[PDB]
């Protein structure tokens, strides 16, 4: 035939979860598109990679129309 | 958290790894072995998952 | 029709059926109660009763409720009723599938045709007092290739079609013997 083909797995998805302590810069979640939006103290890079901008705890916030956001609540 | 007498009666030979680990947590060595433990929510959950192996007693 | 109902509470839904009782529940804009009729009784009752005529349920509370089966859960794997809904009426108008007696010898069956019949019953807004055993359908002038729609129904007084004013009701299709078998076997 002519089929046996596939690009190796990219291992994306939720990397960090809500209620997890995070350093500054830890990739919070790798993703295909905008399956998750940025938020409080959370930036993103060319591949739509979400990552902490501060130290603290992750939190997820669903907002229907707006979409799903993820932020880190600072504290020390 | 009254006492819980638990006696092992069905050999774990053949049951899943997790199950054997449960008996280890409760501290069950050999067959027909006695063991009285508190009735904490945690200790329950284990004794529950091995219920088909042991006979529980409310002491 | 009458039917001896009972109150349910904790009885095992499945273990119940094995006994001989059919699970069910009555309810309306204000009511909600676990019940359970009898299989054999409900059977012969609901056979004719179906879901066009009303049935008062006699609870041990002596209460005579004017209910009708809003829905029945038929069990897959060899048909048989699993569970039964019971909508309790009052005086406010209520929608429901009313029967339909198609009466007449359509031109279709004359030239050798087929008794097509879409909606063997029709949902219609209506007061609880109005309990039309059925509705006359003037099917007779219907020839092969023709059909009859909702916008052409004979509505009794105090009733309205709670459907689409264009829905079909019945039709007249052809046979299908030799002419199709020989022709289809080659033309395919």
């Amino acid at each position: 035939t002519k089929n046996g083909r596939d690009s190796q797995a990219k291992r994306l998805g939720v990397k960090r979860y809500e209620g997890q302590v995070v350093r500054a810069g830890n990739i919070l979640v790798r993703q295909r598109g905008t399956r998750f939006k940025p938020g409080k103290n959370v930036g993103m890079g060319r591949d739509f990679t979400l990552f902490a901008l501060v130290d603290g705890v992750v939190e997820f916030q669903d907002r229907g129309r707006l979409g799903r956001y993820v932020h880190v609540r600072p504290l020390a | 958290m009254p006492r819980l007498k638990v006696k092992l009666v069905k050999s774990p030979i053949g049951y899943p790894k997790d199950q054997k680990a449960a008996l280890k947590a409760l501290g069950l060595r050999r067959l027909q072995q006695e063991r009285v433990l508190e009735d904490t929510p945690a200790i329950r959950g284990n004794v529950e998952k091995v219920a088909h192996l042991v006979r529980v007693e409310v002491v | 029709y009458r039917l001896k109902a009972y109150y349910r509470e904790g009885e095992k839904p499945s273990a119940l059926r094995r006994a001989g009782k059919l699970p069910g529940v009555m309810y309306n804009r204000h009511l909600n109660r676990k019940v359970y009729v009898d299989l054999v009784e409900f059977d012969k009752v609901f056979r004719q009763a179906s879901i066009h005529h009303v049935i008062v349920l006699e609870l041990p509370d002596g209460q005579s409720l004017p209910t009708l089966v809003r829905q029945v859960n038929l069990d897959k794997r060899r048909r048989r009723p699993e569970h039964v809904d019971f909508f309790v009426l009052s005086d406010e108008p209520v929608e429901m599938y009313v029967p339909l007696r198609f009466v007449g010898t359509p031109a279709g069956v004359r030239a050798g045709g087929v008794l097509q019949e879409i909606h063997r019953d029709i949902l219609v807004k209506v007061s609880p007092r109005n309990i039309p055993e059925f509705i006359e359908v003037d099917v007779s002038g219907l020839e092969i290739g023709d059909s009859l729609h909702a916008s052409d129904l004979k509505l009794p007084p105090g009733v309205e079609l709670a459907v689409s004013p264009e829905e079909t009701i019945a039709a007249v299709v052809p046979p299908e013997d030799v002419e199709k078998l020989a022709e289809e076997a080659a033309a395919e």
Binding site: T1, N3 | - | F46, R47, S50, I51, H52, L68, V69, R70, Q71, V72, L74, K76, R77, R78, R79, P81, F87, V94, E95, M96, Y97, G112, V114, L115, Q116, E117, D121, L123, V173, P175, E176, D177, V178, K180, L181
Partner: protein, 136 residues
């Protein structure tokens, strides 16, 4: 038909969605056992049906084969089967309604459906009609 080449085998689990209720016609035919029903099996039944009662009423076929039936040419293991040999099949689970007649007598139907049974692989039953629908 139309869609694309080959499909998984899949297993026939519970008789769930496979099964319904006489939705057209007067009498019906219901499956007791699961199976893949071939295109030739349907045609075999349909024709045996009408041919029984000449110039008959109307026959409804509610099931429909869309699963490509794969099959290899009597060799070994290179790639997937060419398939298509038996053509296609319909995932028929117990309780399903294959055929149902209309505009005809009870004897004609009771015989015709009985006949179109032997044409099928599965052990089947004939249902009348009752009144089991969904209303009030």
């Amino acid at each position: 038909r139309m869609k694309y080449r080959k499909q998984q085998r899949g297993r026939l689990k519970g008789a769930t969605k496979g099964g319904d209720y006489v939705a057209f016609g007067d009498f019906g035919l219901v499956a007791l056992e699961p199976a893949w029903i071939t295109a030739q099996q349907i045609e075999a039944a349909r024709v045996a049906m009408v041919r029984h009662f000449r110039r008959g009423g109307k026959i409804f076929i509610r099931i429909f084969p869309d699963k490509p039936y794969t099959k290899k040419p009597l060799e070994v293991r290179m790639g997937k089967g060419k398939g298509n040999v038996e053509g296609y099949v319909a995932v028929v689970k117990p309780g399903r309604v294959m055929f149902e007649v209309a505009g005809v007598t009870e004897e004609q139907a009771m015989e015709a459906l009985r006949i179109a049974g032997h044409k099928l692989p599965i052990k089947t039953k004939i249902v009348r009609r009752d009144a089991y629908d969904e209303a009030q």
